[PDB]
Amino acid sequence: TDNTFVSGNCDVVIGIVNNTVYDPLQPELDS
Amino acid sequence: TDNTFVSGNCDVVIGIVNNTVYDPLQPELDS
């Protein structure tokens, strides 16, 4: 999430591909 | 962590110094 920014949706940009975005705050929830 | 980014290791950079990088998320999890 630090190297990219969320904008628009997936039905607008042509040629968009599916993938997983790593969130550094998710693994930190255990602490 | 917001003012710096992670690249390479400490055995490459010549003249690297040791310090503590403040992570804003640490006190937020403590609070």
Contacts of B25 in chain A (CB under 8 A): 25, 28
Residue among A3, A23, A30, A31 with most chain B CBs within 10 A, to mutate = A31
Q: In whole angstroms, how large is the CA radius of gyration of chain B?
A: 12
The helix or strand, by DSSP H or E, that contains position A26, with its residue range, turns out to be none
Q: Resolution in A, one decimal?
A: 3.9
A29: which DSSP letter?
A: G
CB contact under 8 A, A25 and B29: no
State the Cα torsion B8-A6-B25-A23 to the nearest 10°. Answer: -60
Q: How far apart are CA B25 and CA B31, in angstroms?
A: 10
